[PDB]
């Protein structure tokens, strides 16, 4: 595969084989009091600063140089330019990759097949702005003349996770907006428990689906429309309560949706990169279009940082390279994302899709199977909650787990004269310090003697109180989690994912891996109907189906 | 370490070396039309059936036999009896491990230091029952004479995740109960945004902490009490709106809560095993104490299953053993929990604590460092949501990821004459079928030809459409997600975690790993006050602190 044959990758491997045991963070920090300055970036966006502190990583200046040389050798800069120039870098689907055009506040032309996309982008944005103002002002009324109080986004995957994560993160900015609800699961619990809390007269449903044929989304959409019409009766009332994020005008009209309330997007918007498009309509409804534009503008800022900054100082590149080091050299299967911010409680879950569906791949551009690792398993919960759930394992288990710790300097809720945020910050800082430093046998012994333990007591407990440390982390600290700042942070990780995928020589922008399960579910659905035993699959699938049929009729 | 020196483990590692490249699930199923019968268990709890189908695992009868031989050699049954008999098996802390006592509905005596714990378990349960009846009926009035409409649990870690997961999972059983809210993060967003939605006249706060010194919980509690008194003014009104769940009578009294408003538990209730105790009070308030007793009864049934069933047919043991196989022979770092149930959306997150804080260890009973893997990273989201997020990596990534797929046969919401649940069941079944079967080059080529692709386009696309398969799963199917059945399922994984801990010779029941971060946060706290530069740590900690101080004063 391309990566394994790359001479800079082999150089990196050889260094790792020879020098791994020099990489002790305590020793590295004791030997270089300038280490923070050498291995951190400060970004001034003009709308807050971002400090990317990567100094608690198992790197030296030589390792960083080797990693930048690998990004050069693997052609990261040229790939980036192909992305931004509208070239068809989604090569298995023959498609451009232009989430960057969605937020191109400069309106610099970006051509696909020699035709600037920016006018179509801005046309949809202008329709979003108009519709948002009509709904939020009370001008748009439901079928009995009431203003909209609840907006229900129905969609799966990329049509769900981004808008949910952002409206959760930007909840303080929703004054004057309707409540937002997200229905994604086909499990009928999800739509049913949502509908039970809503009034049809004042609810607006947003059906998010390019095809308007997606099975889970359209089934949920049909269930919502049945509930709605059980109240309203008149099919013409659907057009006051249902809009579409889609291009299938025919299916949209057939559903009962006025086609001027179809908000379009394009094939070069991947679902897991789509919150910047029409898919973000629920964001703009909730926090207002001005704040949605701020979200776009932050992403645009980070797009320019990624385009103009030398690789050795380029935040998404450096994040990507550190990840390559831990994945392909240390062999770490996972990457933890730990935001110390309750509003970001769905941030890690968003990047499960964005990272794992992008880079959970094993065929390269040439059709060759990889012979190395690709994307990691991403996971996490917000701090400080995760501290009382799983940090025991991060500190004292048998797994090396690279962690990104993120936090805003300024809280949206400075209650108690700042006391809560002060304690939050202190834990953010202490945890990465603890992971780095650990606590030696001698240090733990001293503590146990001071506590008065008997000599046999102390020797018993002592090994359990030792922290081996040397556990690496990134700390990402930013002034305040505003719409602009969130946009910049999300875009940063988008470009990290891109850089990693170029290095591995995979297509970060397709998802052929979802097809087999879809095909097999369609074959099973009709077999569940009626009471006959099923024999057409492997013995386990049959056995499960026949247990299901047996237990359908248990009291 | 003990495990590595165990002769049955060595025989497992040899079998793995000599036959690993022989375990292909398509071939196993083709060779053995009885593979599902031989590699599944059906349990009749008398309150729903449980099918634990472990046949899509990379195992043969010989592996399963070697795995059970390991369980006997590592002494799982004796260790189990020690736990159930009240011995001090939390050996680093000198404590018993008796969450099974909390749900011991048979009231068989369990002695600790020569005294039966059951009378006190039941005294607290009776107190919980009376309190829940009074609050739920409207008998219990707030300071202005109103009934309670909102219950707010303030607690973190083990005093939060359990009660939250269960109230979320059992939301259909909460008709007539007050709304429940969970405040856990120290981040002031969490309490602030909650208090803004509440009326002090009808909100009941529950302060949950064994110790009652958890800094996050006591700070949150003080913030809530300040807010409450801003409206109520009269400090004696606090006894009508605040109760405590703790082991520390004295710390609770020192906070200013009336002592008959304290619901006690005991040092042998680990926080991450504590929802069965007083810590479950918010569950009982929300769904009623009768449904809480069913939850306890479910766990009690699984406790008896675990205690009385031969190892080779014992559900928690078999799950544990399959985990050992994937962790210590295949080297899988992670274990995914994928319930096809939106009500279980917080189940995986609960077992992140239950599994990873228990078995995320590296020192054995003899004080020796392990020289093998211990507990995995647990993660997951409910299906079908996870399906559209990260299954691409499970199918076509470079990682082996043992997955548990869980689903109830009967939905709580049989809308559209069952259509939604039919589709959910189909996806539940197809995904494990797909992970097992894959799709070969030959099969993918035929599909592309049938779809009319040109030879150039076919050959360009073909390798991307191939699924290597052979990815193993458990399927856990149960009649219905009732209070009883949730109790049985949570207990089943508790005992899985116990068995794995005994096999690795670690302590599943301590958590010394959390101390260093707590000590270092206490030192940093005072340093954040005032504008002075901090120089007392490593350069990164200093540099972060000084950036925080710089930017605290920024106007964005």
Curated annotation (Swiss-Prot), chain A:
Keyword Phosphoprotein part of the UniProt annotation: yes
UniProt entry keywords in alphabetical sequence: Acetylation, Cytokine, Cytoplasm, Disease variant, Gluconeogenesis, Glycolysis, Growth factor, Hereditary hemolytic anemia, Hydroxylation, Isomerase, Phosphoprotein, Secreted, Ubl conjugation
Tagged with keyword Phosphoprotein: yes
Effect of residue 374 to R: In CNSHA4; GPI Kinki
A Pfam family reported for this protein in Swiss-Prot or TrEMBL: PGI
Modified residues (N6-malonyllysine): 453
Family annotation (NCBIfam families): PRK00179.1 (NF001211)
Protein name, UniProt field: Glucose-6-phosphate isomerase
Protein source organism: Homo sapiens
Lineage: Eukaryota, Metazoa, Chordata, Craniata, Vertebrata
Gene that specifies this protein: GPI
């Amino acid at each position: 595969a391309a990566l394994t044959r790359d001479p800079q990758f082999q150089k990196l491997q050889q260094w790792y084989r020879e020098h791994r045991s020099e990489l002790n963070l305590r020793r590295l920090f004791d030997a270089n009091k300038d280490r923070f300055n050498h291995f951190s970036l400060t970004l001034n966006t003009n709308h807050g600063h971002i400090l990317v502190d990567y100094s608690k990583n198992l790197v030296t200046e030589d390792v960083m140089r080797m990693l930048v040389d690998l990004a050069k050798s693997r052609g990261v800069e040229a790939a980036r330019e192909r992305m931004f120039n509208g070239e068809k870098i989604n090569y298995t689907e023959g498609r451009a990759v232009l989430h960057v055009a969605l937020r191109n506040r400069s309106n610099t032309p970006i051509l696909v097949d020699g035709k600037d996309v920016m006018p179509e982008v801005n046309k949809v944005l202008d329709k979003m702005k108009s519709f948002c103002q009509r709904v939020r002002s009370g001008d748009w009324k439901g079928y009995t003349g009431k203003t909209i109080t609840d907006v229900i986004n129905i969609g799966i995957g990329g049509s769900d996770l981004g808008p949910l994560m952002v409206t959760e993160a930007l909840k303080p900015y929703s004054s004057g907006g309707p409540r937002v609800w997200y229905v994604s699961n086909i499990d009928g619990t999800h739509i049913a428990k949502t509908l039970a809390q809503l009034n049809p007269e004042s609810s607006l449903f947003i059906i998010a689906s390019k095809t308007f044929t997606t099975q889970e989304t359209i089934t949920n959409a049909e269930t919502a429309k049945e509930w709605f019409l059980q109240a309203a009766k008149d099919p013409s009332a659907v057009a006051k309560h249902f809009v579409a994020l889609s291009t299938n005008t025919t299916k949209v009209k057939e559903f009962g949706i006025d086609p001027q309330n179809m908000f379009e997007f394009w094939d070069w918007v991947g679902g897991r990169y789509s919150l910047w498009s029409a898919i973000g309509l629920s964001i703009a409804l909730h926090v207002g279009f001005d704040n949605f534009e701020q979200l776009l503008s932050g992403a645009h800022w980070m797009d320019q940082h990624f385009r103009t900054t030398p690789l050795e100082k380029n935040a998404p590149v450096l994040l990507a390279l550190l990840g390559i080091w831990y994945i392909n050299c240390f062999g770490c299967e996972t990457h933890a994302m730990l935001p110390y911010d309750q509003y970001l409680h769905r941030f890690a879950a968003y990047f499960q899709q964005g990272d794992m569906e992008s880079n959970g791949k094993y065929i390269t551009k040439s059709g060759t199977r990889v012979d190395h690792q690709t994307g990691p398993i991403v996971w996490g919960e917000p701090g400080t909650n995760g501290q009382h759930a799983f940090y025991q394992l991060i500190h004292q288990g048998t797994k090396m787990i690279p962690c990104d710790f993120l936090i805003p300097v300024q809280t949206q809720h400075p209650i108690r004269k700042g006391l809560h945020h002060k304690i939050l910050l202190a834990n953010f800082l202490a945890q990465t310090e603890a992971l780095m430093r650990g606590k030696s046998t001698e240090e733990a012994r001293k503590e146990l003697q001071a506590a008065g333990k008997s000599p046999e007591d102390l020797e018993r407990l002592l090994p359990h109180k030792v922290f081996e440390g040397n556990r690496p982390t990134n700390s990402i600290v930013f002034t305040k989690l505003t719409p602009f700042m969130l946009g910049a942070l999300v875009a940063m990780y988008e470009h990290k994912i891109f850089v990693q995928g170029i290095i591995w020589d995979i297509n970060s922008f397709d998802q052929w891996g979802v097809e087999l399960g879809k095909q097999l579910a369609k074959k099973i659905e009709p077999e569940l109907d009626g009471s006959a035993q099923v024999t057409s699959h492997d013995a386990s699938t049959n056995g499960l189906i026949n247990f299901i049929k047996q237990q359908r009729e248990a009291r």
